[PDB]
């Protein structure tokens, strides 16, 4: 098991009004 | 097992009002 | 198990009005 | 188990009006 | 178990009006 | 001319991630 | 000309991550 | 011309992470 | 011209992390 | 021209981490 750079943003991000999750194990994501 | 760069954004992202998940194991995603 | 750089932001981020989570184990994320 | 740099911000961040969590074990995140 | 640098800010941060948590065990985060 | 209650929400609204406009005169709405 | 109660919310509103405008004259709305 | 109560919130509002504008004359709204 | 109560909040407001403007003449609103 | 009570809060407000402006003439609002 070798996790690396799961979510990558190479350039600029304006705003985040939702959810940014690299690794979610089960659970509930509501957006 | 070798995970790398699962979600990639090479250029700029305006806004995120939803869900960005690199790796989701089971669970519920509602958008 | 080897976790590294799960959420990566290479350039500038304007604002965060949501949720940025590197690793979420179960649970509930509401955005 | 070896956690390192779970949430990474390479450049400047303007503001944080939400939640930035490196590692969340269960629980509830509301944004 | 070896936790290190869970939330990383390489450059300057303008303001924090939300929550920055390196490691949250259960509990509730409201933002 | 008698405008009244152009957009009505009788019960609870969960979230607004788009645009709610009562009266728009020309212009551009992007969602 | 008689404008009144252009946008009405009778019950509770959870969150507003977009734009709520009662009366917009021209212009650009981006959401 | 008689403007009154352009945006109305009868019950409680949880949070405002966007823009609430009663009357906007031209201009740009970005959310 | 008779402006009155352009933005109305009848009940309690939890938090304001955006912009609440009663009357905006031109200009730019970014949220 | 008769401006009165442009932004109204009838009940208690928890916190203000954004911008509350009664009347803005041009200019830039960033939140």
Swiss-Prot record, chains A, B, C, D, E, F, G, H, I, J:
Site residues by UniProt (Susceptible to oxidation): 24
Q: Where is this site: Implicated in free radical propagation?
A: 22
Q: Where is this region: Interaction with PSEN1?
A: 13-31
**Protein residues bound to Zn(2+) 2:** 2-3
Sequence positions that bind Cu(2+) 2? 2-3
* Result when mutating residue 24 to V: No free radical production. No hippocampal neuron toxicity
Instruction: Specify the superkingdom.
Output: Eukaryota
Q: What residues does the record give for site: Cleavage? A: 5-6, 8-9, 29-30
Q: Which named protein is this?
A: P3(42)
What would be the name of the gene that encodes this protein?
APP
């Amino acid at each position: 098991v070798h996790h690396q750079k799961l979510v990558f943003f190479a350039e600029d991000v304006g705003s985040n009004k939702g959810a940014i999750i690299g690794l979610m194990v089960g659970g509930v994501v509501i957006a």
